[PDB]
């Protein structure tokens, strides 16, 4: 089997991407944030505290003839941005772009934190990291990809995120029309549950490439590119007036600037992030200070190849017995 679904930016900055997902019988369609940095499929629901729902579409298990309470199971998750959610668990039929999994764990939110409530465009998350990170207790549950894998034509999914435009998530096949050149594959460590790999270095603008190993994760659920302070300082030093602002929470730059590109290495290959992809707009409405899309990871504990980096590439998440990642230009 295969599946193919369009993913659409939630706003004019590409802060995140939503993909429609069918849950239950008859189908209830929710727009989920596909997140290769986590492993829970959770949704706003008829069980979510009413004051914490503000415009989202909810899953109502009682209206699904295929929903079944997973007795005794609870979940609770905290994300790198400080947001969180928790609840109980149903199993139900879940379809993405024509690919159907029966018996998928659908984690129903009883509580969500303020940032989820405040984002009316995201109805939940669909985790695509390794199932060892799934938070369901006392019986850990599998991700949608893990459940679908055996049925797929090939045990892969691909992320093709757009810049200020829709893109595609494909399951079970590699669309050879969606990228240019060849796909370069690179090793993955699953030891932390992430799609964790080692970039071979970077360049700033037209500058020379610096060969240096940068371990990090391919994370579709993180907006920006978080890299070591040395790398980030070298980038922003090429932008007149750019500075790190403790009060804003990262590097800012004059909105009048033209930003240089940023290149990262994948083995001997190179992915170029155009300068425009690094502009996240005014820090507050009407400000002439703009927020940078490359930020330091020094306070995180891990480097994160988030959407800023991934949307410059066609990315293969290869879930073969030994997983690997592939990157191509597009």
UniProtKB/Swiss-Prot annotation:
Q: Which domain of life is it from?
A: Eukaryota
Q: Which GO terms describe its biological process?
A: proteolysis
Reactions catalysed, as given in the entry: Hydrolysis of proteins with specificity similar to that of pepsin A, prefers hydrophobic residues at P1 and P1', but does not cleave 14-Ala-|-Leu-15 in the B chain of insulin or Z-Glu-Tyr. Clots milk
Q: Which residues form the active site?
A: 35, 199
Q: Name one GO molecular function term.
A: aspartic-type endopeptidase activity
The similarity annotation says: Belongs to the peptidase A1 family.
Give the protein name, as stated in the record: Endothiapepsin
**Taxonomic classification:** Eukaryota, Fungi, Dikarya, Ascomycota, Pezizomycotina
Within the intact protein, the region shown is: 90 to 419 of 419
């Amino acid at each position: 089997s295969t599946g193919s679904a369009t993913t659409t930016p939630i706003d004019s900055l590409d802060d995140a991407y939503i993909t429609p997902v069918q849950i239950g019988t008859p189908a209830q369609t929710l727009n989920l944030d596909f997140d290769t940095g986590s492993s829970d499929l959770w949704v706003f629901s008829s069980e979510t505290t009413a004051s914490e729902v503000d415009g989202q579409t909810i899953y109502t298990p009682s209206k699904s003839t295929t929903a079944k309470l997973l007795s005794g199971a609870t979940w609770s998750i905290s994300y790198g941005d400080g947001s969180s959610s928790s609840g109980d668990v149903y199993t139900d039929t879940v379809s993405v772009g024509g690919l159907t999994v029966t018996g998928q764990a659908v984690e129903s939110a009883k509580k969500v934190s303020s940032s989820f409530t405040e984002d009316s465009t995201i109805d939940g998350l669909l985790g695509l990291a390794f199932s060892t990170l799934n938070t369901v207790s006392p019986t850990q549950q599998k991700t949608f990809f893990d459940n679908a894998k055996a049925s797929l034509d090939s045990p892969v999914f691909t992320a093709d995120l757009g810049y200020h435009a829709p893109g595609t998530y494909n399951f079970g096949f590699i669309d050879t029309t969606a990228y240019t050149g060849s796909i370069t594959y690179t090793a993955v460590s699953t030891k932390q549950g992430f799609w964790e790999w080692t970039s071979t270095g970077y360049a700033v603008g037209s500058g020379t490439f610096k060969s240096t190993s940068i371990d990090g994760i391919a994370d579709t659920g993180t907006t920006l590119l978080y890299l070591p302070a040395t790398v980030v300082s070298a980038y922003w030093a090429q932008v007149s007036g750019a500075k790190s602002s403790s009060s804003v929470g990262g590097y800012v730059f004059p909105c009048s600037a033209t930003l240089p590109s940023f290149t990262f290495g994948v083995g001997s290959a190179r992915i170029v992030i155009p300068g425009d992809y690094i502009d996240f707009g005014p820090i507050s409405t009407g400000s002439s200070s703009c927020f940078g899309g490359i930020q330091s990871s020094a306070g995180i504990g891990i480097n994160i190849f988030g959407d800023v980096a991934l949307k410059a590439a066609f990315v293969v998440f290869n879930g073969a017995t030994t997983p690997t990642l592939g990157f191509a230009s597009k």
